[PDB]
Every structure is written in structure tokens, then in C-alpha cells.
């Protein structure tokens, strides 16, 4: 029916080998987690692990851990709520959520014995087998949710709030991300079927819509961060965020914030080592794009110019080449970019993460724009560039057949409508079918792995709850950054190639609805419960929004030129296009900043208001006196330039009679 | 020898009309400021002015005004060093410097009755006659800075510090900002230098190097200004400026951050009437255009192409046709600005100085470099364009002279050194030009006034303190806006037409290591001493040389492109130099950006040091215990599957007793 008060959970697998280490390290799990002060108890594993269950004994203790823990972070700015002196009101004005709970037993369980409770972080090395730590699902809470979110039109602020509650700030982001960019959404669907219905195929006007609208969203939405920021306190939480285990520092100097001895590393030589990043780029960028290219142009070989037999059994080839070919190569760039950004040497594991997703980035946009951009830029508007490959290719067929008659083919004429399909692949087949991978085959593949673990002695009371948790277990840990990915793509496809196919857009924001529950469904029901993390910002995806949006801003009306024939494509109107577009992109980005500047942020006027109480607060803890002191100078020659200057007129009487008898000598003579 | 222990003078000139109003005025003014508690004394006038002096009676008052005002500032957060509890140590740990004793008087003289000691603001219309309240200027200090500063080939930050004690934020301000600005011109004057020497006339190396100063001197210059606004204690004194006499409010509503009633004029009625800025920037730039393009052309028709007698007298006639025409056109294009900003309705006074200037710009621009424009982009490029102007100019010629025989003239060949000539000039003879104008000239017709009103009763001991005052109040206040406007001027010189002519960087170097000196003599004895204000900023001079920097990213390259020559300009190739300086000047620009934002800035980790050691300051002023809390729990059927299951193992000895025998249990089978 519900947890039995478990909070979090340790696999602690034990192998056939190393028996005497696993029991070591087992006892000194014990050891450990009493020490910190958390009840344990042990149960079966699945067949050769064993499960361990934690939960907070004291509750007085875990309330004065919870009142420290605000402190800090109202102490360090992430917060500006201050909390009440006593732990009497400040746990009562606002309950600890479940998020945060979860939160601080995670940092006591693992966190270096120094400051924490006890370093049982499963990357340390002294603490293996032990796979991860987590919460459990609420079964319940989670039946109620997708019920509520999949019988609402729209989610309020409420349902955000909840689920930052419950599933913590990440999570949270991440859905109000999604929400505000599928709300966002109805505008370019708007003006694009407008667009589609009323004028043509690549139009000027409708690039420059949604180079408007690319903007707009995002300067909005960074509005929203910072509203949420403070809304859900979590400010520069990056800066609180320790030092990842695997850090090279040459030495520890003072903190100039925090006076507080502190491992230093020189960030000159991190914006070095930085600066190998495009290299890096330069070289997946070249990878992907040699084999694109060659899958595209065996593509156009196959289907535009051939007559033999079987043209649409061999149409495959291309089609299954790329499934085979770009995960070795993607997997190759991401072992060089997991080696690349080691050496970085991040300090914090949020900056590592950060940095591991920019690299990833390179290869996202790689294999999910260079069709597109192949089909825009070398195909449409030039189809001589490609006879070289294609005649390389008739060769390659002709040589691979190895026989006579001379196989015929096809004059090679341009498909005006390559563009068109390619969008309504990328926009509603291949949604479709990143929807089933997302939700229904996941779900139907554990089925099949419980069933068969089932077709191939524990205690009355719990053994619905231990073997629930024996599966959950084996699911794998959500990521919030695929979700993240998958978004910031589709929003690239919106701003770069939407002119192409204009109705792109509202399958978008079919797709953004769907997706809204289909994300909740699959961290409801296909994936454990992830840490509740706190993060301020949804993090490099802003960058690449913003460069995915400049970006767009020019390949739209790149394409606008270049594909309106579907007089001979003068290279200087395709640059005018190009400058005029950016021009007015920054021009509007401009525009929407002030807009935004002047309009106010209602979370950083509560920010500046807190500050204001804060430093007000310390307030509260801590003709007749001219001639008084007029009459001293003279007490204290004894001065003729200076003392006698000012005791001229030494009252007020005096001086409005020197002044009246002034005004009448000096205009008594004329 | 030195001031009469005077602080503030205040002129009053009394006419002969209204007697009675003068005299009520006068009376008013001396209860005024008796009330606010200030020794009044008062003097001869000039002829029909009545000069009186103030200054503090009671030292004691004044103390502890001074340091209600610095916890003022210390409470809206634009100093960041929380003064001591009392008045004992807090004014001798840091002394009341003068320029902060000198506002605050100012502010006591003039501020409204509700919150301060007497409005006597010349602007209110109950005083009239009162021209200006100005302080005094020290000769001594001004003989030994002029000195001081004519004897050093650099000056570090303790002179700067000196200015900004004495003269105010603003003048420092100024001051440190031009010498940062000549400090970087030494890398430009390099380069130019060597760009000359090496290479020839419009480099597109220069170019490109140009633009990496331009933006990386910005930049730099940024982070200065941030890290002085926090040394000399300004940061958002915007925030904390008062309302402007005249400012038009629908309604008085809370403050967001204060909690007091204050005037509010809704921001979007501001961007709406700023819209309007738009069609006056037009306005503007085509009526200068329509007057210095035609001075233009007529002085090429007048030394290019014409043979007739008396070509060296004739020559100055479009010389002397912009020095009447832009005069009287600015003159009416700033009141149209006064005009539109008057409506705009701003608050502070700051930010209505900002908007003025911000329009001032336009013109600024206009007519510092239409000429230049004209002459790289309409003439060298272009030597055809001009052959209908050059004919309505010959018609013209013709029939003005109402003669036969038909006046000879010549062929029409572009002269390809005429930029050359224009940029010497603006570099070397305009700038001697305004040297003179600036420093001899005002100080030679002040001299030969005065002499001349010499020439056309006091007491002993003040005669010369008294005639020193009265040829001080008849000078100009000092108006810093002028020098930062030819500051700006100058860099927009440099980074958009110095590739024509690469050594104008080292003659900018030369003035403005003369500059430097020559402001100071200007503020010394050819100006009374400002009002000492505050700015955490130089103002709308940022976005002026943020605009001027990626204008001039533009202009280098088109005129590289366009003027190379001195095949046929091909627009695509113009095109294409301008997309890649303006990529490159982006590039440059957020790696820069990101470099800085890498480099720790002391002001703000300052600033963030007092907020921590704030924040922190009010916490000094506000296995055996496991099984206690779980033997609670039974004492609380009695919970069949929740009480129970930790119950199982309430003790470490038989949690571990019991994963032993569950190891050996599950490890026995296989
Ligand atoms: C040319 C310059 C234009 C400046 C645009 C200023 C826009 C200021 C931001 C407008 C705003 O925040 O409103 C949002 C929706 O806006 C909107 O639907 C307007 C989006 C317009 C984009 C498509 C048209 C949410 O509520
Ligand atoms: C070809 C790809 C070139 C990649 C160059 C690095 C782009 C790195 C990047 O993310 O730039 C974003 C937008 O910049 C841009 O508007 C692009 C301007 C640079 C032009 C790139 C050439 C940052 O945006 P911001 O941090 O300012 O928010
Ligand atoms: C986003 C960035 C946009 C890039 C546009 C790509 C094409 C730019 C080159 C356009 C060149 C052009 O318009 O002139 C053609 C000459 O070239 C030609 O004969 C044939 C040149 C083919 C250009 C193919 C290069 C595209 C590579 C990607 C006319 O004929
Ligand atoms: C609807 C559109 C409204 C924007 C147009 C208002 C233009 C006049 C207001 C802009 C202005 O005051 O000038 C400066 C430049 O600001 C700007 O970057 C101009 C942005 C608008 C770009 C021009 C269109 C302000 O400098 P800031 O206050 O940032 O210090
Ligand atoms: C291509 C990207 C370049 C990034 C430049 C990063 C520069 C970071 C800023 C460098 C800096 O602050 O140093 C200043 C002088 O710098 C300098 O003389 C360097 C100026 C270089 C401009 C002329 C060459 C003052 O000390
Ligand atoms: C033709 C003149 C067009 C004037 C358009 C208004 C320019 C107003 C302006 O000051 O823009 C500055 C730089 O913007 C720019 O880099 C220019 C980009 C807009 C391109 C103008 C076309 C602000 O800079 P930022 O406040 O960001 O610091
Ligand atoms: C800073 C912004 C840069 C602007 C460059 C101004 C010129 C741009 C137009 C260049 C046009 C070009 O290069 O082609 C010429 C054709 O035009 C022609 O015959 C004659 C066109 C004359 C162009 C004069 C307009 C300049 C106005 C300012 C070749 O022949
Ligand atoms: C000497 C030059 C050094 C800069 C090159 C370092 C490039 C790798 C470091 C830049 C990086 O980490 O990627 C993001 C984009 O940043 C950028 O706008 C890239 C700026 C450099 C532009 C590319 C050249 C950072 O995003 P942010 O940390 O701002 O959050
Ligand atoms: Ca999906
Ligand atoms: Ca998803
Ligand atoms: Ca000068
Ligand atoms: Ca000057």
C-alpha cells in the first residue's frame, strides 16, 4: 500500500569472490550508517545481492539536522526567507517537504567523515558493490498525479509546485521548462498554419515570426528561472554544491567569501585546457558529417537515379548504415570527450555534468541537423555539386555487381518535395516512434524480464512491499538530461528548419502535450525515483537554446533564398538575406531585453525586500544652537581672517539688518 | 590664501523690478536656512547681486547627519562597510572626506521640506534670482594637483582616490575613466604604428585587431567600473536619488523594497513614449546629412573640378557654411530632444540627464562623422555617383555668375588621398583646434572681461577672498558631460575610420596624455567646482561606446573592402567582409566576455565577503540513542507491518548477527 517508512535504499550486491571484503565492507556500512544516526535493517536481495533499509531513527535530531541545513543555506544567500530563531515555527510555517528530507539524508548517508555523516559514496573505492542508493516510489502519489495531469487541459503552478515537493527542484525545472515551452508553442503554430494556409513553402515572413518568437520564449523563460529560483529558494546553489571526490588541486587557500580553508585550482588553466574544446569540435563535427553526407548521397543514389530490381528491398542500406555506424562514432567522440574533460579538472560535480552535456551537445546537433542541413544547402539549390558522389557511386554499384549489360539508370533531376518529406519524418514518424522507445518498449521489455526472472523464503506482511522493491531496484536511474536533450532539440528543429515545413509546429505542440504525461509516466512507472538535486537554472541548455535560436535566425532565411525556385541564386542576395536576418534578430533581441529590463521580476524585488527587512532589522538592536556654537569659536588676534569673518553677524537679526541696509546702499545710487 | 571656512555661496542677484519679491525671497532664504541650521553671512554682489555664504554652526549636528546618511547608504546596500554602532570611531576610521561633507550640505540647502531642511532649488519658481549654489574652489589644492600631475608621466589610483575625495564621484569617475582609456590607446598606437610601417593603407589585419582592442578595452573598462564602484562605496546611487521637481505621477503606491509610499509612473507608458525616439533618430540623421553632404559636395566641386580665379578664397565658402548651418540645425533638433524627453517623464534626474544625453548623441555622431562616412563609402568607392550633384553644382556655378564664355573646368578624377587628409585633420589639426578652444581661449576672455569691468565698499582682511568669490561665480558651472562626449568621440575615431589612416591612434595617445592635464586646468581655473555628485557609472557612455565599437567592427572592414583599390567591388565580396568582421567581432566579444567572467573581480567577492560576515553576525547573537527513539515507537495489533518492521532488528549486535547468518544463508545454496 505505501513504504514502510524507508526512505532510502543501498543494493549492496555480494559476489561469489571477494566474500571476506564484501562482509567488511558490509559491517562498515552498518557501522557507518549508525554512526550517522540512521535505524538499519536488512533483507533479501534478488539472488545475490542485499537490500538495506535506512530511515531516521531520533526525529528531534533529524529536525535540528533539517534547521542547521536552512541556516546554511539562508546564511550562503540561496535562500532570503531567514528562519525563526527557534525550531519551534520555522519547521511549522513551512513543513519540511519531502524533497528536502530526502535531500539531507542522501548528504548524510554519503558525504566525507570530515564534515558529514559517513563517505559511503559508491565511487570512493573502499565502498564497491554497492550500485546506488535510493528513495522509494509512492505508488499512490504517483497514480494520483499521472490521473491528475493526464485528466487536465493545463498543469497551474500548483502541479510544478508539487512535483518540486516531492521529485525536487531538477525534476520540477525540468516540467516547468516544459511547460512554459509547450504554452510558448501555440504562437509559432499559430502564424505557421496561418502561414501555410494563406502564402507558400519558405517564406521570409515566417522565418522572421519565429526568429521573434525564439527570442521572446527565451528571454521569457529566463524571467521564469529567475522567478522560480527564489520562488522555490535554490540561488547559486552551484556555489554551495562541494567539491566532486576527483579533484586535483595544487594548493588550499582561504575562501574570500566564506573565509574557510578551501582546494584552489587556477581557473587560467582550466580556460586552457577549455580551449581544446574545439579542436574536439571541430573533429566530431568533421566525423558525423562524413558519414551523414555518404549515407544521404547512397540515399539519393538508391532512390532518385536507379531502375534495377528490388530498388525498394535495397532502399534499407542507407537507412540501416546510420544505425550501425553513428553509435560507434558517438560513442567513440563521447569516450574522448569523457577523457577531455577529466583532465578539465571541475571542481564541482554540477560544473562536471555541465560540462559533459555541452560536449554531447556537439553530437546531438550533429546527427540531428546534418540531413536537414545537407538536404537545404547542398541539395536543393545545387544539384550539380553532387554529381562527383553520384557518379562515385554508380561506379561503386557497377564494380559491386560484377557483371555485363551496363545496369542503366536515370537522369538525376532534384525532388523539390526531399525537404518536405525529411520535416514530416522529423516532425510526426519520428516523434511516433521516439514516443514508443520512450514509454511502451521499456515497459513492455521489463514485463518480459520480471516474467521470465519469475518462470525461471521471505516474510508474511511484507512480501508484496520487499519484492516491489527488489524490482525497482533493478530499474535504472532516471536522467533528466535526455528529456532535457530531446526538448532543446525540437526547439532547434522549430528555430533552424520550421520555414521548410511550417506546419512542423503544431505537431510540436501535439507532441509537447503528450510528452508533458508521457515524461511523468515514465518516471512514474519506468525508472526509480532519481536524489532530489537542487539546481537554479536548467544549465547549459540555456546556451544552447541561445545558440540554437542565432542559429535559426540565419539558416531560415538561408533557406528562404535558397529554396524559393522550388535570377540564378546570386550569392550577394543569399548574404544580404543572411545579414538582414541576423541584423534584425539582434536588433529584436535587443528590443526584448530592455522590454523584459523594464518590466519587473517580481522575485528579485522579494529578494531586494528581504534584503531590505535584513538590514533594517539591525536598526532597531542598536536660532538658538547656532549662536551656542558661534560664540565658542571665539573662546577657543586669535584669528583675524578666519574667526572674525564669521562672527560678523552672529544672529538672525543682525543679519537681516546688515542685509536690508546692503539692498538699500547698493541700489541707492542708481 | 585659502577659503573663509565658507562651504556653499549662493549668489541672489537682485534686480531692480520686484524689490519687494527680491527682498521676501532673501528674507525667506536666510529663515530657511537658519532652520536647517546653517551660519549665514552675507556681501557685496557683483552690481546688483547679493552674494551670502554658509556653512555648518554646530560640528556635532552636522556628525551626526553624516552619519545618518551613511547608514542610509549602508542600508539601501550602496556601501557595503557597516559603519560603528556610535559616533566615535566611525567618522575617524574613514574621515568625512569633502566631497561627501559638500553633498550632504547641498542637500540640506536644497531638498524638500517634508523629509529635508529647505527647498531652495532654483528650479521651483518661490526662489527666483538665485542663479546657482556652488562651493569654493581651494588654490592651493588646485596649484598643487596641476602640479603634481604635469610632473608625472602616469598617475596611480592614489591621485584618482584624491580627485574622487575632493571633486566628487562623477569627476573621478571622468578622470579614471580617461585614464584607462590612454593607457589602452598604447596598444592600438602600437599596432597602427607598426601596420603603417609594415603594411600599407586599409589592412584588414588592422581591422581585425582594432576590433579585438575595441571590445576587450570595453569590457575591461566594465569590470573597472564595477570594481571602483564598490571602493569609493556608489553602487546603485540611481536607486537611491530622489524624484525630479517636475515628474508627473497618476498614483503614489507602495514600495516594493522600501515599504514607503512613493510617486509610480508605470514603465510601459515610458516605452511607449520612448518609442517615439526612433522617428527623431531619423529626423535627425537626415537633416545632417541633407547639410553636410551638400558642404561636402560643394567643397569637392570647388577644389576638383573648377580653373576659375580666386579658387583659395572661394574654397572656405562650404567651410564656413557648416559652421552656421549645424549650429542653428543642432540647436533645433535639441530643443525637439528637450521637447520629447520633457514628456518622457522621468524620475530621477539622473535619468533624465542619461535620456538627454543619449539624444545629444545622434547629433554628436552626425556630425563628427558624416563627413568621414561620405568620404569612404559615397566618394573613393564611388566616383560616379556624384556626377548629378557635381552637374547641379556646375548649373549653379553658371548661373549664379550670369556671365559668358562658358567658365572652364576639368575632368573628374577622386582624389584617393582625400581621406587621408580628412583623418589628419580630425586627428592633428581639430584636436589642436579644440585644445585651444578648450584651455586658452575661455581663460583669455575671462581675463580680458574682468579686466574690462576693472576698468569700467569692502573691509580689510576679505577684499580679495570677497573679489575672488565674485570672479568665481560669474564662470560656467563645470559640465563633465562635454569631456566624456569627446572622450567617446575620440574612441568612435579609432574604432571605425582609423584603418584609413592606422597612425591617428598614437596622435589620440598624445592627446589624451595632454587631456588629462588640460581637464584639470580647465576644472582649476576655468570653472567654479561642480556639485559634488555621485554615479556608480559613467552613464549611457557605455551603450555610446558599445554601439560606436560594433559600428566601427562594420565600417573597418567595408572600408578595407571598398577602398583597397586606391575586380570592380563586387557587392557579394563588400558583403562577405562585413558578415565575417562582424562573426569575428561577436566571437571575440563573448570570449572575452567569458575570460572576464573567469577572472575573479575584488569588488564584487568585497562586496560578497560584507554580505557573508553580515549574514553571519546574527548567529552569535540568537547506538544508545537509536534504540531510545525506536522503544518509543512499540510504547506509541499496534501497527502490524509498519511498528513491526523495524522493530525486527533494534540494535547494531543483531543487525549484524543477522546479515551474517543471511550471507551464509543466501552464499549456501550455490
Ligand atoms: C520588434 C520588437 C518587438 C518587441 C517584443 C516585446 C515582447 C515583450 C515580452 C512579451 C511577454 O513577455 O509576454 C509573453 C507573450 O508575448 C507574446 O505573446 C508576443 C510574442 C510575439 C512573437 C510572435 C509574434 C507572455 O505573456
Ligand atoms: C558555427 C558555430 C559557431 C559557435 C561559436 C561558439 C558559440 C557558443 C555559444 O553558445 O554562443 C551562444 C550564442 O552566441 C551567439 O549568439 C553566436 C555569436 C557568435 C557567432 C558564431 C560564429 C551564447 O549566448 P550567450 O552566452 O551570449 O547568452
Ligand atoms: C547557414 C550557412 C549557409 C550556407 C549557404 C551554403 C551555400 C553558400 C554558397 C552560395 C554560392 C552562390 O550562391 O553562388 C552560386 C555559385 O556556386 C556554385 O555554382 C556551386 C557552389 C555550391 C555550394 C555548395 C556549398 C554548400 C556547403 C554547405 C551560384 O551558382
Ligand atoms: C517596443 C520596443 C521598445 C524598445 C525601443 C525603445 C528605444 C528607446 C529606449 C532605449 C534607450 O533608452 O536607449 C538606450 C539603449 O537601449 C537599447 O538597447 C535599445 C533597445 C531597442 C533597440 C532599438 C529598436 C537605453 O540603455 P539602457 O537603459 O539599457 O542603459
Ligand atoms: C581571440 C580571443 C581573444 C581573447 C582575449 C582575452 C583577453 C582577456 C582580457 C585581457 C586583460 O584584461 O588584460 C588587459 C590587457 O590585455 C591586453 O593587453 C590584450 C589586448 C589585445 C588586443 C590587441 C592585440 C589589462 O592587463
Ligand atoms: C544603424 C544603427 C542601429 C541602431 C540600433 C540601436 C542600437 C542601440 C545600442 O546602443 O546598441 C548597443 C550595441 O548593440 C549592438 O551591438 C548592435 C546590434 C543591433 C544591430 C543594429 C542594426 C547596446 O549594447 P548592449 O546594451 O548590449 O551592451
Ligand atoms: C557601413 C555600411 C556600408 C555600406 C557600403 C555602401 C555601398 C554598398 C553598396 C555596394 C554596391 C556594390 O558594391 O556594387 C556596385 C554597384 O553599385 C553601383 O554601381 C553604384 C552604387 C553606389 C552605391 C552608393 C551608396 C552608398 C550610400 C552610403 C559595383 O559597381
Ligand atoms: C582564449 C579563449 C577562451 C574561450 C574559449 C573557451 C571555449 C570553451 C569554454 C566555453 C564553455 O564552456 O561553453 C559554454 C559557452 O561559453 C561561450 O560562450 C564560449 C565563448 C568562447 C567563444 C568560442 C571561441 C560556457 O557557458 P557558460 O560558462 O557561460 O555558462
Ligand atoms: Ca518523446
Ligand atoms: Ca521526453
Ligand atoms: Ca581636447
Ligand atoms: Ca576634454
Same mark, same amino acid.
Given at each position: 500500500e505505501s513504504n514502510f517508512g524507508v526512505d532510502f535504499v543501498i543494493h549492496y550486491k555480494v559476489p561469489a569472490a571477494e566474500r571476506d571484503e564484501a562482509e567488511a565492507g558490509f559491517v562498515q556500512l552498518i557501522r557507518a550508517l549508525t554512526t550517522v544516526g540512521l535505524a538499519t535493517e536488512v533483507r533479501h536481495g534478488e539472488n545475490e545481492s542485499l537490500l538495506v533499509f535506512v530511515?531516521?531513527?531520533?526525529?528531534?535530531?533529524?529536525?535540528?539536522?533539517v534547521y542547521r541545513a536552512r541556516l546554511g543555506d539562508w546564511l550562503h544567500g540561496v535562500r532570503v526567507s531567514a528562519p525563526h530563531n527557534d525550531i519551534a515555527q520555522a519547521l511549522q510555517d513551512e513543513p519540511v517537504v519531502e524533497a528536502e528530507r530526502?535531500?539531507?539524508?542522501?548528504?548524510?548517508?554519503?558525504?566525507?567523515?570530515?564534515?558529514?555523516?559517513?563517505?559511503?559514496?559508491?565511487?570512493?573505492?573502499?565502498?564497491?558493490? =554497492?550500485? /546506488? +542508493?535510493?528513495?522509494?516510489?509512492?505508488?499512490?502519489?504517483?497514480?494520483?498525479?499521472?490521473?491528475?495531469?493526464?485528466?487536465?487541459?493545463?498543469?497551474?503552478?500548483?502541479?510544478?509546485?508539487?512535483?518540486?515537493?516531492?521529485?525536487?527542484?531538477?525534476?520540477?525545472?525540468?516540467?516547468?521548462?516544459?511547460?512554459?515551452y509547450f504554452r510558448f508553442l501555440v504562437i509559432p503554430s499559430a502564424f505557421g498554419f496561418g502561414a501555410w494556409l494563406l502564402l507558400g513553402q519558405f517564406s521570409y515572413l515566417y522565418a522572421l515570426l519565429c526568429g521573434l518568437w525564439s527570442v521572446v520564449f527565451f528571454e521569457y523563460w529566463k524571467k521564469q528561472e529567475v522567478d522560480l529560483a527564489v520562488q522555490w529558494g535554490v540561488?547559486? =546553489?552551484? /556555489? +554551495?554544491?562541494?567539491?566532486?571526490?576527483?579533484?586535483?588541486?595544487?594548493?588550499?587557500?582561504?575562501?574570500?567569501?566564506?573565509?574557510?580553508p578551501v582546494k584552489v585550482y587556477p581557473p587560467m588553466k582550466r580556460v586552457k585546457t577549455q580551449l581544446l574544446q574545439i579542436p574536439f569540435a571541430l573533429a566530431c563535427v568533421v566525423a558525423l558529417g562524413a558519414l551523414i553526407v555518404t549515407c544521404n548521397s547512397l540515399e539519393v543514389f538508391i532512390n532518385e537515379v536507379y531502375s534495377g530490381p528490388g530498388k525498394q528491398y535495397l532502399g534499407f542500406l542507407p537507412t540501416i548504415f546510420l544505425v550501425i555506424g553513428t553509435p560507434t562514432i558517438s560513442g567513440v567522440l563521447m569516450g574522448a570527450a569523457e577523457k577531455?574533460?577529466?583532465?578539465?579538472?571541475?571542481?564541482?560535480?554540477?560544473?562536471?555534468?555541465?560540462?559533459?552535456?555541452?560536449?554531447?551537445?556537439?553530437?546531438?546537433?550533429?546527427?540531428?541537423?546534418m540531413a536537414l542541413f545537407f538536404t537545404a544547402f547542398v541539395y536543393i539549390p545545387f544539384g550539380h555539386i553532387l554529381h562527383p558522389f553520384l557518379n562515385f557511386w554508380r561506379a561503386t554499384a557497377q564494380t559491386?555487381?560484377?557483371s555485363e549489360k551496363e545496369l542503366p539508370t536515370r537522369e538525376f533531376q532534384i525532388n523539390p518535395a526531399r525537404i518536405s518529406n525529411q520535416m514530416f519524418y522529423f516532425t510526426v514518424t519520428a516523434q511516433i516512434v521516439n514516443f514508443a522507445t520512450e514509454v511502451v518498449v521499456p515497459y513492455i521489455k521489463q514485463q518480459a524480464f520480471q516474467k521470465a526472472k519469475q518462470l525461471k523464503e521471505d516474510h508474511e506482511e511484507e512480501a508484496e512491499f520487499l519484492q516491489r522493491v527488489r524490482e525497482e531496484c533493478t530499474l535504472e536511474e532516471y536522467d533528466v538530461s535526455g528529456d532535457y536533450r530531446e526538448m532543446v532539440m525540437q526547439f532547434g528543429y522549430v528555430a533552424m528548419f520550421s520555414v521548410a515545413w511550417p506546419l512542423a509546429a503544431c505537431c510540436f505542440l501535439v507532441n509537447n502535450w503528450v510528452e508533458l504525461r508521457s515524461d511523468a509516466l515514465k518516471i512514474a512507472i519506468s525508472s526509480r525515483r532519481p536524489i532530489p538535486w537542487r539546481t537554479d537554472?536548467?544549465?547549459?541548455?540555456?546556451?544552447?537554446?541561445?545558440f540554437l535560436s542565432w542559429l535559426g535566425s540565419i539558416t531560415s532565411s538561408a533557406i528562404v533564398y535558397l529554396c524559393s525556385n522550388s535570377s540564378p541564386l546570386k550569392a550577394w542576395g543569399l548574404l544580404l538575406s543572411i545579414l538582414f536576418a541576423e541584423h534584425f534578430y539582434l536588433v529584436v533581441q535587443l528590443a526584448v531585453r530592455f522590454v523584459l529590463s523594464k518590466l519587473d521580476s517580481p522575485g528579485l524585488q522579494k529578494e531586494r525586500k528581504e534584503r531590505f527587512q535584513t538590514k533594517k532589522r539591525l536598526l532597531q538592536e542598536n536660532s538658538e544652537k547656532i549662536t551656542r556654537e558661534a560664540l565658542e569659536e571665539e573662546a577657543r588676534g586669535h584669528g583675524t581672517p578666519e574667526?572674525?569673518?564669521?562672527?560678523?553677524?552672529?544672529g538672525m537679526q543682525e543679519t537681516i539688518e546688515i542685509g536690508r541696509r546692503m539692498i538699500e546702499q547698493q541700489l541707492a545710487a542708481g
Open positions: 530511515k531516521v531513527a531520533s526525529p528531534d535530531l533529524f529536525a535540528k539536522q530526502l535531500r539531507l539524508i542522501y548528504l548524510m548517508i554519503t558525504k566525507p567523515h570530515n564534515e558529514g555523516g559517513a563517505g559511503v559514496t559508491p565511487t570512493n573505492a573502499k565502498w564497491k558493490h =554497492v550500485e /546506488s +542508493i535510493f528513495p522509494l516510489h509512492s505508488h499512490s502519489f504517483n497514480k494520483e498525479w499521472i490521473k491528475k495531469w493526464s485528466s487536465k487541459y493545463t498543469l497551474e503552478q500548483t502541479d510544478i509546485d508539487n512535483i518540486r515537493d516531492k521529485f525536487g527542484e531538477s525534476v520540477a525545472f525540468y516540467f516547468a521548462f516544459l511547460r512554459s540561488r547559486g =546553489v552551484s /556555489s +554551495i554544491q562541494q567539491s566532486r571526490p576527483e579533484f586535483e588541486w595544487e594548493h588550499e587557500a582561504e575562501d574570500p567569501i566564506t573565509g574557510e577531455l574533460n577529466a583532465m578539465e579538472n571541475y571542481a564541482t560535480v554540477d560544473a562536471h555534468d555541465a560540462a559533459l552535456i555541452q560536449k554531447q551537445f556537439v553530437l546531438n546537433f550533429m546527427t540531428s541537423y559491386l555487381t560484377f537554472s536548467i544549465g547549459p541548455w540555456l546556451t544552447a537554446l541561445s574667526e572674525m569673518f564669521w562672527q560678523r553677524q552672529r
